[PDB]
Amino acid sequence: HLYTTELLIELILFKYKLIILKFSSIKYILNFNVRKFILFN
C-alpha cells in the first residue's frame, strides 16, 4: 500500500477538481491559486 491508496486519493481529488473546472473559468482558478500561494508564503 501507500501507493495505490495515494493514487486513489489523487483520483478522487481529480474528480472533484474536474467538477470545479466544469463550472468555472481559468482566470478565476488562477487568481484563487495565486492568492492561496501568497497566503502560504
Partner: protein
C-alpha cells in the same frame, strides 16, 4: 441593471457583507457576460474584432480590480 446569469451567481454567493469579499469573486461574476452569438464566419470575425476592441478600450479605461463600475456588486445584490 443585471441579468439572470449574474443574479444566479450572486444568489448562490452568501455570507458576504463587504465589497472586498465580493471583489474576490470578480472573475466568477464576470462569467455572467455571456454572448449568445453564432459560430458562423461572420460572427467569428465579429467576435475577434469585438474582443480586440474590448481589450484596447480596457487598456484606455485602466481601472483597478477594486473599482469595477461595469461588474455589478453588493448594491445590486
Amino acid at each position: 441593471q443585471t441579468n439572470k446569469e449574474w443574479w444566479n451567481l450572486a444568489k448562490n454567493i452568501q455570507d458576504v457583507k463587504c465589497q472586498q469579499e465580493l471583489n474576490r469573486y470578480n472573475d466568477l461574476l464576470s462569467q455572467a457576460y455571456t454572448l449568445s452569438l453564432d459560430n458562423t464566419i461572420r460572427n467569428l470575425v465579429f467576435k475577434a474584432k469585438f474582443y480586440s476592441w474590448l481589450f484596447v478600450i480596457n487598456w484606455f479605461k485602466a481601472f483597478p480590480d477594486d473599482f469595477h463600475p461595469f461588474i455589478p456588486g453588493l448594491e445590486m445584490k
